[PDB]
Amino acid sequence: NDFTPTEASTQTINFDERSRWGGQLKTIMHTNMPNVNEYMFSNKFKARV
Amino acid sequence: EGRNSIRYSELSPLYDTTKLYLVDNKSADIASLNYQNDHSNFLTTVVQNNDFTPTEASTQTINFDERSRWGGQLKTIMHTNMPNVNEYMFSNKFKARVMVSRKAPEKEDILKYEWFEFILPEGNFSATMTIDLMNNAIIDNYLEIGRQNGVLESDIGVKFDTRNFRLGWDPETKLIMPGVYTYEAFHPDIVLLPGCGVDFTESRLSNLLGIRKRHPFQEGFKIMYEDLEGGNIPALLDVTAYEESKKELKIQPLEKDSKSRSYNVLEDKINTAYRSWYLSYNYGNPEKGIRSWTLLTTSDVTCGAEQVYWSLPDMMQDPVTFRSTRQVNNYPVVGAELMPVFSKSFYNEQAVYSQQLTHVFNRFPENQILIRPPAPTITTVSENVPALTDHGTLPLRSSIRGVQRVTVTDARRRTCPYVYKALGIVAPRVLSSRT
Amino acid sequence: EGRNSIRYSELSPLYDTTKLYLVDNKSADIASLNYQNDHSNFLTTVVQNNDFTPTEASTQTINFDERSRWGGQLKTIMHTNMPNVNEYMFSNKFKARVMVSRKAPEKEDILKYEWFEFILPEGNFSATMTIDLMNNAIIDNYLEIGRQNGVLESDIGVKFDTRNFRLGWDPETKLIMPGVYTYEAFHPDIVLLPGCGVDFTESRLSNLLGIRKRHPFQEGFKIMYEDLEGGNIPALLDVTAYEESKKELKIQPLEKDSKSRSYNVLEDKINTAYRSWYLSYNYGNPEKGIRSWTLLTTSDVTCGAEQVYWSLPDMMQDPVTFRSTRQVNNYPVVGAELMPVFSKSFYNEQAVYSQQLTHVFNRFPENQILIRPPAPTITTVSENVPALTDHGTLPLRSSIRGVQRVTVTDARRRTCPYVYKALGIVAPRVLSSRT
């Protein structure tokens, strides 16, 4: 918060060459989707009558 | 040798020293880069080529040879135009408590009082004209409010003067024997009536008046009538009814000035109700008196010396303890200087006193307390002088972009609008190795 | 290389030179650190961060790399406001022995004498106004005591003048032929009567008067009537009763000034009892006379040049022979300078002499000895000029705390209350190795 995000976009973090680096990744995620919806194709079917 | 090259991107390399120029009035930069800024926060090109527009120059670089540590000697030219009195420096305002609404009961002449916070014009003035404007600022509010209510001309509340009201004070008569006060200027002074006062907090004109505090770092500055113990102005002698016994002694004071204007004489016939700062400072009790917490000094028409800070945050490395940022509020500092402001003095013969027309700065010519103050024989005025300054050598950045930001700030970290010239010259040299 | 790093406690290290600033008007320091001190003994932060309060900064450190010896070039800015006449510098007092109680016997008019130690007001004045105030200081005590007893106006005892009382002195008449003394100023002068004297010990106004000692380092300075052998002022000619024989010679002196005031003429008719310093210095016996132990010099309106001492006892190492201490009485000295005080001169045409009203500085206008002195054609006045000073390079301490003490002192090791600006800049560089 001395820098705006635009200004931050030009900045860099530099991991020392002469070494190969790796990163362990952890994630948190939380959803809200309903059972029946159009996105997942779960509100339609066909029938001959 | 070897670790001393200076390389532009397509031209012959130089070696071991050059110059860099930071001028502010190149046409191409006037047109494109600088449209919404001023001479104190500007943006210039370090490339002098005119094969390239400044936009194109912004992508170019000057490269000082790694394997060496470089430093730059900095010289500056600066010229200003600021007036003595202005709003930017808080030098055109002050506060005062005065009287309003002198009406009779329904004991004797109940009175109301309040503060008003006056303002005066803007310009570059001597230290005599300033006093006159400060008096007119009060007379105008008098004509605005107190004239239409029941306040009189003999009871105003505040005046600024230059006289010593104790010369000619035989200590058997206990009065002013010539029947008139001395028309000579010694040092400026405040005079007050009961229930009134002055406040120079968030102001600067106290330095012009030569009044200062013994502990400047506390809160602020306020003088009231109840702090001037010992500064009562003595009354005059009644010379008009004096020769009638001298042609067996008639020693009474005066009361009026031939215009039905009271002198605020007290129940006794030795002194008046007007108090004064100079008298209480010189003649009153030094322990239990205002001398214990105030101080007499010379008048400074410049209204205080103040410093400036230079910043070049794309060429120089940040000095110790400074953070890197991109806010104009706090860039890093590469040099400090004083405002190029100086007092100059002049002799004022005048050979003529008490000229009297109805001049606006002498509205009350008959009264010896409300008369226009006398002028000093030494006049003082502020002037701007161009400043040539060497700031020493600072470390440089290894790579230098073609477009640079130049900034000048005041103590409170605000850009000064009264800079209209700012030139910069930088001379790089090797300082050490990194091998 | 390697032994050239500059490390703050959490930020990128610099190398081989930086700057440090020592300003006195940062808001956070005004509020907290500096509440009971002034601009000459103040306390400031060397950290410019505003993530930290100054209290928090006091625990932080700047660390200059051990394995090297560092030194700092010091530059200073300073601006003052002190008046010419003041109590701080012992420039508003002097002593004089005068006469009181002229009563007849019960042989001729027994007389008493004593010392009084006068005082005069405070302000910044020219060298003419100062003389007038010094005269009024004596006239006031006259009106206080001697007027009510039997002392007359023709026998005061002391006066300060500027005239040469020997022009127009035909050595056949042995008197002043024009019947009047020359109204031109040459150099200031003391005039005395018997039994009276002046003492400028523990005072400074002797330098304003241009009178000095040939051996200044002894005890003090005292002039008495019995040391002015040869300075008797000649009497005037009686022109009033001169044309009665010239229309056979009438050459008598005058006795009165048309106001029943004796000239203190002696038994002979060639000279008076008033003595004078200038006459005894120029016309008397140079061996057995006051010229043997006094000296004539120019007037110095500044009342003497005096030096100041800077101290920074948390940044610099102590120079040789100085002890380490924490008393404001004697800190170590890092720089010496002169008070920024300068005389300025002006021309005074005036084209008008002997104006005569009953002006307070001319109470005795008819008498040619007690008349107001004439003014020089060259006026002189004191002024304050800001001082820019380089003090050289001094050794630094390896570790520097974030809060620093800044002190200015006079010769007698007292803080000057007439400093209202003090800026400091320090530029560290490597001087040697310790490896």
Numbering used by the authors:
A (entry chain QA): 99 to 147
B (entry chain O), C (entry chain L): 50 to 155, 201 to 341, 385 to 493, 500 to 578
Q: What's the publication's text?
A:
We had designed ADDoCoV based on a penton base protomer derived from human adenovirus serotype Ad3, which can efficiently self-assemble into a dodecahedron. An epitope (AH) encompassing 33 amino acids of the ancestral SARS-CoV-2 RBM spanning residues Y505 to Y473 inclusive was introduced into the insertion site of the variable loop (VL) of the protomer. AH containing protomer was produced following our established protocol resulting in highly purified ADDoCoV adopting the dodecahedral structure characteristic of this protein nanoparticle. We determined the cryo-EM structure of ADDoCoV at 2.36 Å resolution, providing near-atomic insights. In a previous X-ray crystallographic study, a central α-helix had been identified, thought to stabilize the adenoviral penton by coordinating a bivalent ion, Ca2+, via glutamate residues. In ADDoCoV, this α-helix seemingly underwent a helix-to-disorder transition and cation coordination was not observed. ADDoCoV contains 60 AH epitopes exposed on the nanoparticle surface in flexible loops, available for antibody binding. We probed the dynamics of ADDoCoV by MD simulations guided by the cryo-EM structure. For about a third of the simulated trajectory, the AH epitope adopted a conformation closely resembling the arrangement observed in the open form of SARS-CoV-2 S, with the RBD in the “up” position, positioned to engage ACE2. We observed virtually identical melting temperatures (~55°C) of ADDomer and ADDoCoV, confirming that, irrespective of AH epitope insertion, the advantageous thermal feature is maintained.
